[PDB]
Every structure is written in structure tokens, then in C-alpha cells.
Amino acid sequence: AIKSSILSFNSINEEAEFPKVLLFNDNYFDGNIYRINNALSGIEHDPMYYDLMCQSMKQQIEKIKIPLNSSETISVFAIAPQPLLLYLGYLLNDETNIKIYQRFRTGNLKWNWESSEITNNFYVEQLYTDGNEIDTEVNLILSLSAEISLDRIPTFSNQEYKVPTLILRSDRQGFDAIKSNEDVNEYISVFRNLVVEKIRNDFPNLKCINIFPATPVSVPVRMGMNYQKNIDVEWKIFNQQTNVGFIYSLSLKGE
Ligand SMILES: Nc1nc2c(ncn2[C@@H]2O[C@@H]3COP(=O)(O)O[C@@H]4[C@H](O)[C@@H](COP(=O)(O)O[C@H]3[C@H]2O)O[C@H]4n2cnc3c(N)ncnc32)c(=O)[nH]1
């Protein structure tokens, strides 16, 4: 009832600290730790990295769904490229008995929350005036850990092809944009209600959201859990990579 298992994913070892974090959050470790292996470490370089990592993660999560779903609570400590954190949340896709933790740069317990209340506000800028019935794609910039300047987003030169764009920002940007679970809960509410659902209201024939993110670890995992399989449109996530800009990584997609 207070019992929690641990799920650990590190592809970028603080595992000995995780039971202590549970105790600070009304839990205690139940003895079940599920380690998601970094299967294709060494091939982080070539353009098949995300395809191959997703296949490994999917197989690893399927083999433990029976023990996983038997957990009273699952406490998740995941740090990886944002697309794989999104995919992890998609594989877990269960907002109810799952607690997603955030890693901080300083502190006695790097993975314990720095606050128990809302510390930030999240808000939307839209770079278009009106929706329409023609556009099928939207660009979504997530500027939490840093402000992604618009010159970094692939943008079509001709006006008839320019993709409508929205930005989701926080009042406080930086590595501590998320300090509490309350912060993430509020982010996810804004993301779902004022971004994802708003975009589909504005563009009723939407097929795809292109995501360009600078966010801390808890945010992509919680967005992946928030994905509504076969209901949401395709979410294509791009990744900032050295000397190349934002490159397409992977999609969350219906079947
Ligand atoms: N500063 C900055 N970052 C940008 C910009 N455009 C894209 N980014 C990407 O966003 C991520 C922000 O870094 P973060 O530390 O707040 O969160 C990362 C991220 O959730 C996950 C994977 O890291 P990475 O692929 O490098 O993505 C980084 C950036 O490239 O892990 C988090 N992370 C990485 N290192 C740590 C750490 N020591 N402690 C806690 N979390 C970490 C841009 O313009 N500016």
C-alpha cells in the first residue's frame, strides 16, 4: 500500500539513492527494481539509434508487464534523450499508480523533489492568427529548460507552405523549470488542454504534431504517458544534435 517498485532507465549509477527518495514520498521500496538496459550503447552515433533503442525498450517492457502491473506503485527514475523518455512514457502509459521523478543537479538526493507546491507557470504563444480546415501539421516548440529560438526550427520559405507553429514556455526557464510533481501536473494540464486539444480545435484535419523540445526529464516521460493511443494524432519528436540542428527521432502513432 505504501509499497513501490522502482523502474530505472539511464542511457546518457544513482540507483542506491532511489529507495531513500521513495521514503520521502510516502512509499518504501518493495524489492522489485526493473532496470531498462541501454542495449545499443556504442551505436549512439548512427541514424538507426532511435529505431533500435525503441525496439529494445518495447521488448524489455513487454516482458515485465505482468510484474509491472502487479505493483502497488511504480516509481520511475529515467534519464535519456528526450525522444526515448517520450517513448518510455508511451510504453508505461499509465498515469495512475506511476510516479515520475525529476533529476536535479544539486542536493542530498538528486532525484527528490525540490518543492511540494507549484513553483512555475506554463503558457502558450501561437504564431498564427486563425485555424483552418486545410493544414494537417503543426510545429510545437517546448521551451522549458531553455528558449529555443525560431531560427532553429526548419521552416518553409514560401507562405503557402509555412507550418502553423505554437510555443509552450514557462515563466522560469532553465534546468529547474520543474521543481515539484505539482509543477509537472500543471505542465501536463496546459499541454493537454491548451496545446494538444487546442491545436485540433483550430485545425480539425490535423494529422501530425512536430515537437521540438528543450525540457527536463520528467516532462517527456509524462507526455508519453499522456498520449491517447489510436485517439491522438501522430506526435513526431525531433532532437537537437550537435552541428546538425533538430533531426527527426521517432513518432508516437496510432495503429
Ligand atoms: N540548455 C539547452 N538545451 C537544449 C536546447 N535545445 C534543446 N535542448 C535539449 O533539451 C535538453 C535540456 O537539458 P535538461 O538538462 O534540462 O534535460 C535533459 C533532457 O531531459 C534529458 C536528455 O538530455 P539532452 O539530450 O542533452 O537534451 C537537452 C538539450 O540538448 O536529460 C536531461 N539531462 C541531461 N543532463 C542532465 C543532468 N546532469 N541532470 C539532470 N537532467 C539532465 C537549448 O537551446 N539549450
Side-chain angles (χ1 to χ4, degrees), residues 100-139:
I100 302 308
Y101 283 91
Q102 169 65 49
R103 194 189 185 269
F104 298 89
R105 256 89 173 161
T106 71
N108 296 329
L109 294 177
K110 299 280 177 304
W111 289 85
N112 195 22
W113 299 111
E114 291 191 340
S115 174
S116 281
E117 61 182 347
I118 288 169
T119 76
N120 216 339
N121 177 58
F122 308 89
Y123 64 100
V124 184
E125 189 176 7
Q126 69 182 69
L127 301 184
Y128 57 94
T129 299
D130 305 291
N132 68 66
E133 292 190 26
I134 292 147
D135 278 297
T136 58
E137 298 191 347
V138 163
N139 292 334

Side-chain angles (χ1 to χ4, degrees), residues 192-253:
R192 169 56 57 182
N193 299 118
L194 306 178
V195 176
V196 172
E197 304 287 338
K198 154 192 177 61
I199 289 167
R200 208 151 189 188
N201 291 332
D202 287 349
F203 302 103
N205 294 315
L206 184 76
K207 302 181 172 169
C208 173
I209 304 176
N210 302 301
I211 301 175
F212 302 88
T215 67
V217 302
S218 57
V219 164
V221 179
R222 290 282 303 275
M223 313 167 42
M225 293 159 62
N226 192 251
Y227 190 80
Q228 301 172 9
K229 297 183 180 161
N230 290 352
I231 301 290
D232 274 317
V233 307
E234 181 176 4
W235 299 358
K236 297 188 183 174
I237 185 158
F238 290 68
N239 194 57
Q240 167 61 38
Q241 292 164 208
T242 70
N243 291 315
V244 190
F246 280 98
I247 296 301
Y248 169 79
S249 302
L250 59 91
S251 292
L252 308 189
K253 204 182 199 263

Side-chain angles (χ1 to χ4, degrees), residues 12 79-82 103 105 145-146 152 175 213-217 240:
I12 283 174
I79 177 161
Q82 295 168 94
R103 194 189 185 269
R105 256 89 173 161
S145 305
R152 295 170 56 198
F175 296 141
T215 67
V217 302
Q240 167 61 38

